Amino acid sequence: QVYNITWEVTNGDRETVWAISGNHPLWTWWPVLTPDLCMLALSGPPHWGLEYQAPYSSPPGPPCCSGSSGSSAGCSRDCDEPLTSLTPRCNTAWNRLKLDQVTHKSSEGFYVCPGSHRPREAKSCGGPDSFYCASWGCETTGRVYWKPSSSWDYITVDNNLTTSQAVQVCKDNKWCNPLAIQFTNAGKQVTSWTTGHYWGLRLYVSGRDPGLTFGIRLRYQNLGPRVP
Ligand SMILES: *[C@@H]1O[C@H](CO)[C@@H](O)[C@H](O)[C@H]1NC(C)=O
Ligand SMILES: *[C@@H]1O[C@H](CO)[C@@H](O)[C@H](O)[C@H]1NC(C)=O
Ligand SMILES: [Zn+2]
Numbered sequence: 001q002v003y004n005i006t007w008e009v010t011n012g013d014r015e016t017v018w019a020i021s022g023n024h025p026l027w028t029w030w031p032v033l034t035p036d037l038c039m040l041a042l043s044g045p046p047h048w049g050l051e052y053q054a055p056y057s058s059p060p061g062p063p064c065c066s067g068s069s070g071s072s073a074g075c076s077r078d079c080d081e082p083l084t085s086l087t088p089r090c091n092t093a094w095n096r097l098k099l100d101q102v103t104h105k106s107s108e109g110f111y112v113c114p115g116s117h118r119p120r121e122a123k124s125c126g127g128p129d130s131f132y133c134a135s136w137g138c139e140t141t142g143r144v145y146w147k148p149s150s151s152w153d154y155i156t157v158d159n160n161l162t163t164s165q166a167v168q169v170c171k172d173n174k175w176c177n178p179l180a181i182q183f184t185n186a187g188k189q190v191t192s193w194t195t196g197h198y199w200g201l202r203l204y205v206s207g208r209d210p211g212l213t214f215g216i217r218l219r220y221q222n223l224g225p226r227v228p
């Protein structure tokens with residue numbers, strides 16, 4: 001029986017911030033989810049700079065003079081200036097370029113730790129305040145050089161684009177920090193996806209490691225004769 005399957009990704013307030021739908025039999029469709037890291041941050045931790053923005057809103061910041069469709073009045077030169085001094089966050093096109101730089105540099109990157117579906121790793125991995133990653137060993141994925149993995153956790157997370165592919169997307173003042181979230185074989189075996197599972201993500205930068213939490217949940221609805 002085919003259903004309209006929607007895979008939703010939520011911010012930490014458990015509100016859908018991104019979704020993908022497709023007509024498939026239940027528990028057969030496991031697409032790479034590509035939410036933007038900054039969408040996870042919508043209405044999230046203050047670091048990212050999107051606290052006041054709602055799910056599904058637009059990237060903040062002025063248009064870059066280097067935008068693909070041309071330069072508009074009020075365009076910022078800054079999308080093209082050195083990223084050296086900037087904080088990796090989501091409030092302008094250049095801060096997001098900086099965020100892309102951090103998520104891609106071999107010495108930095110980001111790592112992800114499981115929420116409530118974790119075992120007795122509660123013991124010190126912490127709550128949402130530590131983005132479930134209070135200590136090393138808590139992370140089960142991410143793009144960082146020690147390549148953390150797990151045989152029980154439900155997802156792998158990486159950057160979806162390389163910086164060369166992301167640079168003009170950020171200069172077009174579009175969301176340009178996409179994650180590529182793949183379902184693992186253990187994840188394809190759980191059926192609790194309708195209640196949804198949560199993770200924390202943290203950048204590996206400056207001895208601070210700014211983070212946020214996000215969720216993944218399943219929704220499905222009938223199609224065809226079963227729709228009344
Ligand atoms: C569900 O599937 C139908 C048919 O493919 C599509 O038109 C509709 O927009 C989808 N809605 C949602 C909320 O997924
Ligand atoms: C993710 O990467 C795939 C493969 O390069 C690409 O087709 C897709 O457009 C990308 N999505 C986002 C949101 O970056
Ligand atoms: Zn910060």
Ligand SMILES: [Zn+2]
Nearest residue numbers: 076077078079
């Ligand atoms: Zn300026």
Ligand SMILES: [Zn+2]
Nearest residue numbers: 077078079081
């Ligand atoms: Zn400047």
